[PDB]
Amino acid sequence: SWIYPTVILCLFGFFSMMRPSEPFLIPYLSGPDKNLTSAEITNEIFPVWTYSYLVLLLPVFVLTDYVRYKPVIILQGISFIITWLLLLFGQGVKTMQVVEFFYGMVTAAEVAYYAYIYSVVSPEHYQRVSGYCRSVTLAAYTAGSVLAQLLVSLANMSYFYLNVISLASVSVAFLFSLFLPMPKKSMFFHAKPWFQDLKECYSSKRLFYWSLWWAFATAGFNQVLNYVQILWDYKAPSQDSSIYNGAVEAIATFGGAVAAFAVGYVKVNWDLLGELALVVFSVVNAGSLFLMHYTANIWACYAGYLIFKSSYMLLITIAVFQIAVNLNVERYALVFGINTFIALVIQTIMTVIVVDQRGLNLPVSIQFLVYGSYFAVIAGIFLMRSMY
Numbered sequence: 001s002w003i004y005p006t007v008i009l010c011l012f013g014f015f016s017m018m019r020p021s022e023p024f025l026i027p028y029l030s031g032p033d034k035n036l037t038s039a040e041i042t043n044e045i046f047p048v049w050t051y052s053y054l055v056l057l058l059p060v061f062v063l064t065d066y067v068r069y070k071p072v073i074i075l076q077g078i079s080f081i082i083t084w085l086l087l088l089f090g091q092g093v094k095t096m097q098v099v100e101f102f103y104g105m106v107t108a109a110e111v112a113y114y115a116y117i118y119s120v121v122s123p124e125h126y127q128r129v130s131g132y133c134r135s136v137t138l139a140a141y142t143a144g145s146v147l148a149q150l151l152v153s154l155a156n157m158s159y160f161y162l163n164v165i166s167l168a169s170v171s172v173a174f175l176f177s178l179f180l181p182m183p184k185k186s187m188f189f190h191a192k193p194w195f196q197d198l199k200e201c202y203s204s205k206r207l208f209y210w211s212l213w214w215a216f217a218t219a220g221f222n223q224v225l226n227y228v229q230i231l232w233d234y235k236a237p238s239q240d241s242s243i244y245n246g247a248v249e250a251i252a253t254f255g256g257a258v259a260a261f262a263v264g265y266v267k268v269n270w271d272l273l274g275e276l277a278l279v280v281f282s283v284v285n286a287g288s289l290f291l292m293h294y295t296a297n298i299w300a301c302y303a304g305y306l307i308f309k310s311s312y313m314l315l316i317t318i319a320v321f322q323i324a325v326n327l328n329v330e331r332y333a334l335v336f337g338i339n340t341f342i343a344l345v346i347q348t349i350m351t352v353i354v355v356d357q358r359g360l361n362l363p364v365s366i367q368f369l370v371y372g373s374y375f376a377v378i379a380g381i382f383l384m385r386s387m388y
């Protein structure tokens, strides 16, 4: 039997990721409804989110496999409700950091939400149902951004009612998430029958470098998707010029889907390709960051974000395909959790040095030059690897 938990899971993935006010969030924080300047959003509230995704990574992962995946989705729905009720009714540098704290706990519970597929479905339908759930979530976010563009850019709806629609969507998601079946078995703790268990997978000289590049690229993309909407707000003000953020992020998610669909059908020989395309797409990423930083037109910044997100989705799907060649079921999520923790340590150190208020207190313009130099160092490491 594989019908009804898949149906309820896909309906929650549809009505949970269908959130319209995600591209139009950074004008809502600095608009006439919330008196917040750009520096108070850039250097004070957002990096706390990263803190809430570091400190709440390891215990919530313990909450992933111990209570067997139902209370973590119930907590994710409650966190949806609290997050959007405090977005509609929170003003200040305290309540918005509470919003970012609960959204970091949302992002922590999302990883537990990915692992519900492999623990309620029979093993004849792992990859098919997992790809269907990922496609439903991505298409739900795409349709939500398209609906936001149709309601804001054409139908002329305010942002407050857009967050009201987002609250109604996550409330319907909570009502769908309460009706989930409890799995009696788990993956690690209550499964069917460290100090000396970690050395076996990490006794390599290839998978270590691929996981390290996965970690650096994940930290870089997390910071770029943190501050790319503030870059959009800086290159074009939300109250002065007409901004088209919903359509651009919809086309960006669609292009990431097209990039993943293109990676899923690569019948190209892997003799010289493993040391050829990585350097080229790294130069493309550095040039996209430099094109978004050295420009003044907002349209060039949208195009640079499109090219950068498509190239990152392509490279990261190649990375997930190459790391998960000789991995088991449990070791998949375990090694990805360890690599996610390493990526978050790197992101935390880089955010405290570059972005955080207790420190340099840098504006949003200099930070994109910093991350361009970051990906330039990554491209130089791939160039030195290609010379070998």
Ligand SMILES: Cc1cnc(Nc2ccc(OCCN3CCCC3)cc2)nc1Nc1cccc(S(=O)(=O)NC(C)(C)C)c1
Binding pocket: 022, 025, 046, 049, 099, 100, 103, 107, 141, 222, 225, 226, 227
């Ligand atoms: C409702 C909300 C509350 N707080 C925030 N702050 C925030 C802004 C940008 C962030 O960048 C990281 C985005 N995702 C990338 C991987 C997990 C998190 C993380 C947090 N954003 C929010 N909306 C949001 C803004 C940008 C991206 C996203 S997303 O994570 O849902 N992007 C997709 C998963 C759809 C690709 C969501």
